Design a binder for this molecule. Structure first.
Ligand code: CL
Lengths: 212, 211
């Protein structure tokens, strides 16, 4: 019967603001401490902010103190999170969660989350390098932003033995990936191999010839 | 500031006992809590106050804590127990809520499989452009957990190492990749560089040399 549903997440640029809401039903929202917990894609859980039943007690993570503001409206059964000065690092799924009465069971029920993506509108095209060679060869698609890039080989005529790897998000905020293909070693001096890299966001397409 | 430390991964055969530890400096004076998060779902509390089960939680789940460590024990692992597990506690002041980094628990459900490892040196083009990247490509492994260490000649390399999270391949095995960024000078000045991939206690190392 208990239900927590959050909303307000979306795609925004750094510096901008977003307001998250959470609606609670099936229980007396007025009696419980409420929290926002966030989770970046592929990463762990991180407490964001908490607020007691009557708003008398409020806490923030140090990473968000001064930028985010939590509040609630007991009459409206709603928990809020006003998020100002958003940064790329704030990108996460944002969960609403409650404590049990007295806090004996912390985070004893959670919503399914609302997604917040913070991304610069600026774009950088990929530098494509050959990964030169019964034999494996490929392309390094280096230093681009944002996702996605798609890769084919020989204009898609070569699909057998192709493995394009999920990109790494580097500390620089830029992405890199590699696509490799397994080919006959005996066919290396004859066949020409070309990876077709497509980066729609920067309106760039690159065909790289891979030579031994 | 305050940290809770957990092993990144644990494997267990169905019906066997899995143990996930959580280490933290404030645990001698604070309770520990455990959360289970299955793929694509919100977390669920499975242990509170070191060792107590919330109503509805199966008795195969148990907990204990002593000094700076808390341990989650799952006695007789079921495949549905496969998930990420987070320990939770507050800092000493009690002002911050902190989770551990989480532990990926695999309950073995398909054939084990050592990773294939392909290492590429920096290309002439990139070097000729005053940059240098080593690419370590890691595929077809199960369970989906790996640790990657790098070596310059015989010495550990830690700076400039970037490594993805493993992804499920088309064949339900996992892939990952690790990149090492160097200056062209660093690359040409060592007899060799090595990528060391550790999977389920065993390690495969591929090495390359400037030649
Ligand atoms: Cl304790």
């Amino acid at each position: 019967e208990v239900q927590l549903v959050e909303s307000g997440g979306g795609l925004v640029q750094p510096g901008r603001s977003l307001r998250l809401s959470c609606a609670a039903s099936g229980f007396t929202f007025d009696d419980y401490a409420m929290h926002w917990v966030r989770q970046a894609p592929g990463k762990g859980l991180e407490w964001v902010s908490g607020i007691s039943w009557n708003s008398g007690s409020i806490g923030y993570a140090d990473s968000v103190k001064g930028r985010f503001t939590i509040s609630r409206d007991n009459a409206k059964n709603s928990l809020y999170l006003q998020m100002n000065s958003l940064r790329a690092e704030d990108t996460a799924l944002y969960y609403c969660a409650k404590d049990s009465p007295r806090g004996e069971l912390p985070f004893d029920y959670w919503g399914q989350g609302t997604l917040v993506t913070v991304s610069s509108a600026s774009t950088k095209g990929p530098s494509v390098f050959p990964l030169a060679p019964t034999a494996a060869l490929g392309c390094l698609v280096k230093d681009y932003f944002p996702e996605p890039v798609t890769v084919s080989w020989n204009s898609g005529a070569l699909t057998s033995g192709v493995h394009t790897f999920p990109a790494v998000l580097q500390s620089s905020g830029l992405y890199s990936l590699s696509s490799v293909v397994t080919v006959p070693s005996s066919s290396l001096g004859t066949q020409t191999y070309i990876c077709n890299v497509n980066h729609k966001p920067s309106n760039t397409k690159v065909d790289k010839r891979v030579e031994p | 500031s305050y940290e809770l430390t957990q092993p990144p991964s644990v494997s267990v055969s169905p019906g066997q006992t899995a143990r996930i530890t959580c280490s933290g400096d404030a645990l001698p004076k604070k309770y520990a809590y455990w959360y289970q998060q299955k793929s694509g779902q919100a977390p669920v509390l499975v242990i509170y106050e070191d060792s107590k089960r919330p109503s509805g939680i199966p008795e195969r789940f148990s907990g204990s804590s002593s000094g700076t460590m808390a341990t989650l024990t799952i006695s007789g692992a079921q495949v549905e127990d496969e998930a990420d597990y987070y320990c939770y506690s507050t800092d000493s002041s009690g002002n911050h809520r902190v989770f551990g980094g989480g532990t990926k628990l695999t309950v073995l459900g398909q054939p084990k499989a050592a990773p294939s490892v392909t290492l590429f040196p920096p290309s002439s083009e990139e070097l000729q452009a005053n940059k240098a990247t080593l690419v370590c490509l890691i595929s077809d492994f199960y369970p989906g957990a790996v640790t990657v260490a790098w070596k310059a000649d015989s010495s550990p390399v830690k700076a400039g190492v970037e490594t993805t999270t493993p992804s499920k391949q088309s064949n339900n095995k996992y892939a990952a990749s690790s990149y090492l960024s160097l200056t062209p000078e660093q690359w040409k000045s060592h007899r060799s560089y090595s990528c060391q991939v550790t999977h389920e206690g065993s390690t495969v190392e591929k090495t390359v040399a400037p030649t």
